[PDB]
Design a protein around this nucleic acid. Structure first.
Lengths: 115, 201, 103, 104, 49, 49, 66
RNA sequence: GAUUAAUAGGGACAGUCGGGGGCGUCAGUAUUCAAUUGUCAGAGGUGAAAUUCUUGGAUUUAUUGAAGACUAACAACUGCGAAAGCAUUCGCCAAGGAUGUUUUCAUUAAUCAGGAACGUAAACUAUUAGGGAUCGGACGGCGUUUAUUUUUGACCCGUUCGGCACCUUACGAUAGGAGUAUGGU
């Protein structure tokens, strides 16, 4: 079981399913939400997150890591500090297609004082 | 494209667990509203314990939990139960299309009496503007001290975010409710489906 | 100046206690309560809103309220309603929730 | 440390609610908070200036520092839990494979 | 009519003067799952037993 | 009458407060190891000839 | 003397104000303490314990610290 | 030759108290900008879009560096300042409040004409008589924890001054519009 670290940037406009190694430096495979949906309205949707998570899990099972540590974030500076629908739907599809999940953490950038 | 299916069917290696801390006046209400919470979290597969000695709610993923987003649902649920949302609403976050949000509004007004006036202006006469916002945005809004805790669909989360910031920035919520009613009337007919609607507000 | 804005603000209590907000817990309970899943619930809400509209137009007394009670029923009803509002005010003074100010 | 690594230690310490009490707020006074912070920085300096980095990590793992802060601050105001929330290594001036392989 | 309410008399006198079951106790109170410091004392008693 | 009713409610509140203060001072002072002096005995301050 | 301690507080306030020069709370307290000095000084003039031509503006402060 | 020492003053000392003020210093993230890598097709907004940035690689991932801002959560039916206002640590500088004292001159005082210092908004509105809370002293103590035992502090309780606010009671008080017509301009 080779643990890869999946950054899921779930905003309200698009979701980013991103898979890196344990370092954070070397991106293995990323599929954004809007490259699976023709409509910019429905770019941030549970269907978009499901398609992105299925493609990412397929690539990472072709590479043979079959285990992820998932770090979920959102727009946190002056944003909302809550993930969009992409987080729940991508984690659901990601563990529904293989991918024994390891450690889940919501690493949102929380400002001590922004404005 | 937007609907979400319930999870049909061990997806967890490290046994995840989350904790939140509550005070005593919430300890009473949580002690006599807890069996509803642990009943629904047992239906989702997550063990939920409450500690009146230290004052801590814990959730933890059991052996037979299958939904992996259930731990995020449970973490948000115990966050809202600590932040004194009532118990059926906190359990209503466990549906698929709901999400919560906390809006920090104390940073937006330098003054104090002006802040109290604008917060009560957000709350309205007899709560009528607040429940009008809840109707027009399909949300649950709770004006919680220095914060505002909202729940609902993500569209309603965005609209109540805009309305709460514009209420704190001295635009009136009755003006914003009139704006939202105009937007609802325009989105009713799809003959005007893609124009710039700024000529009406 | 605007009419339907004034109607939406006043009748929001009745609509949001009837059925119109499925993310609110009281409305999601009152959407399955039974007196709103019956056959003509929308018409009964329409009668309540029309009574409130004539009250806003200037009627001093209502059509929907009952006028004669045996004094123990009305004292129990008024005392229970006042104790409920007082308990909600106290459980909102604790937890720091701010509420609508009304005497 | 004695191996000339500069590092920052960020400690957090929450106030103990005493059992068999009735008052809801366990507020320490501001002068009492300043005395607690003075004893906290005195403890972490006196028990992190003497050891090397490997012994410092071996003391950080079972949280001996937070335990000794909890033990020695309870004559000023009892503290519910003392943790060290961050360690940040700023500069490491040496690359020595001898000690770096004596680790592994 | 006129006999004692024994529960009320015991409560009145209270407000005036003021190894086989402790396992099914934990069996009934592991199901709540409120931790409830009397159960902490019962856990220490069961560990001593 | 309303004045007498309001003032006897105030008197009940004040007497209950004084009894609670005396009971707390008894439970946390050195008077705990004494017999409770009855109220008819407390009615007289001193007697002299 | 009460007047002696009051003018000592006045010189201390004015010296801190000369070193810092930016704050206004010390200037307001200086106005309060100079009004207090002048009132107590006027009562001691109309009694007569001190010279009626004795005055304190800043030079008496300077010549009593010097 | 010089009164009560005021349940009005001003001062002194002691332990203090405060997100009161000034100057320096220390941090914390977040945002922007730049650099180094892994990138490899969109990203961004919106109810939808569009302007814009995008194979010289945008958005993203990681690590540093700089700049400016602000001080989350704690954070209150609280604290301080006369007011606007005041929340990172530490140091320095004066000042201020209350308490206690086995502290002093003994009317110094109260009020404001004149004058003097500090400075995008609005939009639902002699006691009351105590009680429950609250914080700042001072005193007292059956006791739990510091405490290897004395300090001392935390918790509980009582007394006493002082102050922000709650509720009850008052002790009382008191301060033209809308329609419909008709005739002119």
């Amino acid at each position: 079981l080779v643990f890869g670290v999946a950054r899921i940037f779930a905003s309200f406009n698009d979701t980013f399913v991103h898979v890196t190694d344990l370092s954070g430096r070397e991106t293995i495979c990323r599929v954004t939400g809007g490259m699976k949906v023709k409509a910019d309205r429905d770019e941030s949707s549970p269907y978009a997150a499901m398609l992105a998570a299925q493609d990412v899990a397929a690539r990472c099972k072709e590479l043979g890591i079959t285990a992820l540590h998932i770090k979920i974030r959102a727009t946190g500076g002056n944003g909302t500090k809550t993930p969009g629908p992409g987080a729940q739907s991508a984690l659901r599809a990601l563990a529904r297609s293989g991918m024994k999940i390891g450690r889940i953490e919501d690493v949102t950038p929380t400002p001590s004082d922004s404005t | 494209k937007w609907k979400i299916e319930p999870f049909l069917p061990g997806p967890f290696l490290e046994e995840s667990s989350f904790m939140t801390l509550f005070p005593k006046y919430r300890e009473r209400y949580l002690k006599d509203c807890w069996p509803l919470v642990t009943k629904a979290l047992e239906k989702h597969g997550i063990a939920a314990t409450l500690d009146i000695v230290e004052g801590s709610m814990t959730v933890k993923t059991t052996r037979k939990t299958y939904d992996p987003a259930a731990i995020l649902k449970a973490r948000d649920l115990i966050k809202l139960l600590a932040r004194s949302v009532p118990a059926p609403q906190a359990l209503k976050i466990l549906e698929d299309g709901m999400a919560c949000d906390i809006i920090k509004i104390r940073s937006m007004v330098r003054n104090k009496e002006r802040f109290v006036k604008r917060r009560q202006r957000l709350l309205g006469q007899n709560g009528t503007t607040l429940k009008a916002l809840e109707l027009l945005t399909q949300t649950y809004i709770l004006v919680h001290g220095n914060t505002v805790s909202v729940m609902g669909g993500y569209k309603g989360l965005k609209e109540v975010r805009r309305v709460v910031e514009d209420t704190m920035n001295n635009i009136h919520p009755i003006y914003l409710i009139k704006e939202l009613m105009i937007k609802r009337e325009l989105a009713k007919d799809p003959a005007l489906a893609h124009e710039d609607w700024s000529r009406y507000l | 100046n605007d009419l339907a804005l004034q109607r939406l603000i006043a009748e929001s209590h009745i609509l949001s206690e009837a059925g119109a907000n499925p993310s609110h817990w009281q409305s999601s309970h009152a959407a399955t309560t039974g007196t709103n899943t019956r056959a003509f619930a929308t018409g009964r809400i329409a009668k309540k809103t029309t009574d409130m509209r004539i009250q806003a137009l200037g009627a001093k007394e209502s059509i929907l309220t009952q006028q004669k009670m045996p004094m123990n029923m009305r004292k129990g009803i008024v005392k229970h309603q006042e104790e409920k509002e007082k308990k909600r005010r106290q459980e909102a003074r604790e937890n720091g929730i701010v509420l609508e100010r009304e005497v | 440390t004695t191996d000339h690594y500069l590092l920052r230690l960020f400690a957090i310490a929450f106030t103990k609610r005493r059992p068999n009490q009735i008052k809801k707020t366990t507020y320490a006074q501001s002068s009492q908070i300043r005395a607690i912070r003075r004893k906290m920085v005195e403890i972490i300096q006196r028990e992190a200036a003497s050891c090397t980095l490997h012994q410092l990590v071996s003391k950080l793992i079972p949280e001996v520092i937070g335990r000794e802060i909890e033990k020695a601050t309870q004559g000023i105001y009892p503290l519910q839990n003392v943790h060290i929330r961050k360690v940040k290594l700023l500069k490491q001036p040496k690359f020595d494979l001898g000690a770096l392989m004596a680790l592994h | 009519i006129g006999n004692l309410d024994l529960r009320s008399e015991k409560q009145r006198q209270a407000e005036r003067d003021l190894n086989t079951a402790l396992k099914k106790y934990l069996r009934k109170q592991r199901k709540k799952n409120i931790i409830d410091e009397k159960r902490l004392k019962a856990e220490e008693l069961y560990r001593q037993m | 009458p309303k004045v007498v009713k309001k003032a006897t409610e105030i008197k009940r509140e004040e007497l209950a407060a004084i009894k609670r203060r005396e009971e707390n001072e008894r439970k946390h002072s050195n008077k705990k190891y004494e017999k409770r002096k009855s109220e008819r005995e407390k009615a007289v301050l001193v007697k002299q000839q | 003397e009460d007047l002696y301690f009051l003018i000592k507080k006045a010189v201390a306030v004015r010296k801190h104000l000369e070193r810092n020069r930016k704050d206004k709370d010390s200037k307001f307290r200086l106005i309060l303490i100079e009004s207090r000095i002048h009132r107590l000084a006027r009562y001691y003039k109309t009694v007569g314990v001190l010279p009626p031509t004795w005055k304190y503006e800043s030079s008496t402060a300077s010549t009593l610290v010097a």
